[PDB]
RNA sequence: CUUGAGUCUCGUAGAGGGGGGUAGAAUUCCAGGUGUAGCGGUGAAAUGCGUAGAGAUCUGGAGGAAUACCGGUGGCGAAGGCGGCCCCCUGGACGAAGACUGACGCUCAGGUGCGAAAGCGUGGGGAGCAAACAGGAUUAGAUACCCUGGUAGUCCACGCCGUAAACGAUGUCGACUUGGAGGUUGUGCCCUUGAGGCGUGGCUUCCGGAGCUAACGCGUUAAGUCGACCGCCUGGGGAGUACGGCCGCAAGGUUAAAACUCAAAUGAAUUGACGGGGGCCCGCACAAGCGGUGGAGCAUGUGGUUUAAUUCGAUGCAACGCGA
């Protein structure tokens, strides 16, 4: 992640790489691994990944 | 609940003309004796005259400005805990809040007659002092000290 | 004092707290702000509106050195990962390279279980 | 004899396996600078760590384990199970033309081999996580859930144990019976003249048709219709326990009863009910206000108590100035 873009202002843009990490890739971890719990949910979400 | 209303206004000032002022006469009015309310909310300004001087009209609102809040908190339960999320009160209830807290202390003066027990607080605001004005900033305490919320 | 003008200021946003440490240019402390020691803590701290006050509090405890333009380094999903930044773009501080460092192991360690509330 | 099955040729994809190296991110630790009164944690806290200078921030070093993104209803394997990269050794699968073999096949009690995780023996290894254990907290109690720590183990080499909801809870092989969309991987072909258009195979998801089914559902990868062989079931509790045999260092595994007792135990589905399940929506339910009760004295009813009787009925809201 990098930021420079000149032009005087301070709108935001803190959403660029944002949607590629954030407290998401973090929340993805931090707590005990899933081991088997993923093979189920990660493959159970597909049930919805269709309709 | 699922319906909405407007407001319940009434006959304004008997002569000085002032709708909201009526509230000060109603809110203070007890046992439904408005006939006597006008005897206190009116005679009050007739005493602050020499006290302050300038039109009793302004006199009221003047010190009243140092009694009306502008930010309060409302208990909101979440996941078991009930935060005290703050919230800036609009003018509508703002002016009201003051009058309530104002008339209250006035009746807690514990002296003799209310006519005076009312003027005291009516002026105590500007000069700053009393139970009424107390609440004003007293509410500010809880306020911001919870800004971590809203 | 030394006069750097060009320094950094990493933001450590932990789910429970956050500390703003304005470092020099080569990585040297110059003043650290902490959300906890901000006159408030517990459920009051952590929050952005609060945990941020610490960040901007650096000024009256860091600017004593004299700084103008500077970049920023964010590391931590804490409830202030952003809020803290705004205080910098309002306290007079300029702004430059804003990059996120927040670590992420390529699957190496093993986080603790727990959390059975 | 050749269609079953098998060999040859050429290619095709893949986390298949064993071994040997190697890479980058991150935690922990140790060291040094900067810098200072907090960090960490939680619902809050406290234990714990800080002025002997932590945390953060930066620089150097050590080590172990795991391989983010890719990555997927994706792939490979008998199953268990198998992910960075590279090399070496090596198993299976699949498609293309033919060539060769010529029923050489299917299944399989016993027998043999492989076996997640935990565990066991010997020697190594040890960063992170964590049985045990020790504090802190919660509670009426809390030998728990939560926090702070933390040993075995988790890692490696060799040997052992052989279990699992070892699950598709569905033995293997073969033959057939509408179709629809997608995945993945070979191969033929079409201005290839496009991404693409049309074929034909291997494996694979979701749907569903006849049929099957107690129903739920299965439905060409069947639970459909047939055949070959094998394993197993015969009411629930007692009990996968006891005794014995066999296996194991052990923990225990395997085979496996009876007495006594019950009239059931049980599967699917239906209606309602309920939930510290979800969605939605109302009522002075709450929220927003005002005024009350419990305080005091007295009135009235009641329970209790008392009395020769204190007539009887009324009892959560929905009894208690109620029948009166
Ligand atoms: Mg623990
Ligand atoms: Mg397969
Ligand atoms: Mg093991
Ligand atoms: Mg061992
Ligand atoms: Mg179907
Ligand atoms: Mg049932
Ligand atoms: Mg109503
Ligand atoms: Mg209320
Ligand atoms: Mg009250």
CATH number of the domain enclosing B108: 1.10.455.10
Assess if residue B61 is contained within a domain: yes
Whether nucleic acid strand D comes within 7 Å of the CB of C73, the answer is yes
B26 falls within a domain: yes
Residue A26, both tokens = 């973090």
| Residue B6 covered by a domain | no
Whether chain B lies against chain A with 3 or more Cβ pairs closer than 8 A is no
For residue B119, tell me if it sits in a domain: yes
> Range of B120's domain?
19-142
The verdict on residue B1 lying in a domain is no
Min distance C12 CA to chain A CA atoms (Å): 13
C36, C43 Cβ separation under 8 angstroms: no
- B68: helix, strand or coil: coil
Q: Specify if B3 maps to a domain.
A: no
Task: State both tokens at C67.
Answer: 């700084």
Range C6-40 burial, b when 16+ CB lie within 10 A, else e: ebbbbbbbbeebbbbbbbeeeeeebbbbbbbebeb
What's the CA gap between C60 and C32, in Å, rounded?
11
Residue C33 host element (H or E): strand C32-34
- Angle value at C-alpha B124, between B118 and B127, nearest 5 degrees: 160
**Experiment type:** X-ray
Phi/psi at B81 (5° precision): -85, 140
How far is it, in rounded angstroms, from Cα C65 to Cα B36?
68
User: Could you give the number of structural domains in chain B?
Assistant: 1
DSSP alpha helices (H): ranges in chain A? 22-27, 37-41
Please report whether residue B5 resides in a domain: no
Q: Which residues contact B82 (CB under 8 A, 6 or more apart)?
A: B75, B76
Chain C residues with beta carbon closer than 8 angstroms to that of B150: 49
**Any atom of strand D under 7 A from CB of C28?**
yes
Q: Is residue B70 assigned to a domain?
A: yes
Q: Is C43 on the interface with B (CB under 8 A)?
A: yes
């Amino acid at each position: 992640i990098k930021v420079r873009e000149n032009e005087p202002f301070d709108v935001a843009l803190r959403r660029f790489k944002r949607s590629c990490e954030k407290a998401g890739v973090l929340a993805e971890v931090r707590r005990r691994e899933f081991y088997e719990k993923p093979t189920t949910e990660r493959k159970r979400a597909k049930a919805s990944a269709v309709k | 609940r699922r319906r909405v209303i407007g407001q319940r206004k009434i006959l304004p000032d008997p002569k000085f003309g002032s709708e909201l002022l009526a509230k000060f006469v109603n809110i203070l009015m007890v046992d439904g004796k408005k006939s006597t309310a006008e005897s206190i909310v009116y005679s009050a300004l007739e005493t602050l005259a020499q006290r302050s001087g300038k039109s009793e009209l302004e006199a009221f609102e003047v010190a009243l400005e140092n009694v009306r809040p502008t930010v309060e908190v409302k208990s909101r339960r979440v996941g078991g805990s009930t935060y005290q999320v703050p919230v800036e009160v609009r003018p509508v209830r703002r002016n009201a809040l003051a009058m309530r807290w104002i008339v209250e202390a006035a009746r807690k003066r514990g002296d003799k007659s209310m006519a005076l027990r009312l003027a005291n607080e009516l002026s105590d605001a500007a000069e700053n002092k009393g139970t009424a004005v107390k609440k004003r900033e007293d509410v500010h305490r809880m306020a911001e000290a919870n800004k971590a919320f809203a | 004092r030394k006069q750097v003008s060009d320094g950094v200021a990493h933001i450590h946003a932990s789910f429970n707290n956050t500390i703003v440490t304005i470092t020099d240019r080569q990585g040297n402390a110059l003043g650290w702000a902490t959300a906890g020691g901000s006159g408030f803590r517990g459920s009051r701290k952590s929050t952005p509106f609060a945990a941020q006050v610490a960040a901007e509090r650096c000024a009256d405890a860091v600017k004593e050195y004299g700084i103008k333009n500077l970049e920023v380094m964010v590391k931590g999903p804490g409830p202030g990962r952003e809020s803290t930044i705004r205080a910098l773009n309002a306290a007079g501080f300029r702004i430059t390279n804003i990059t996120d460092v927040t670590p992420i192991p390529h699957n190496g360690c093993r986080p603790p279980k727990k959390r059975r509330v």
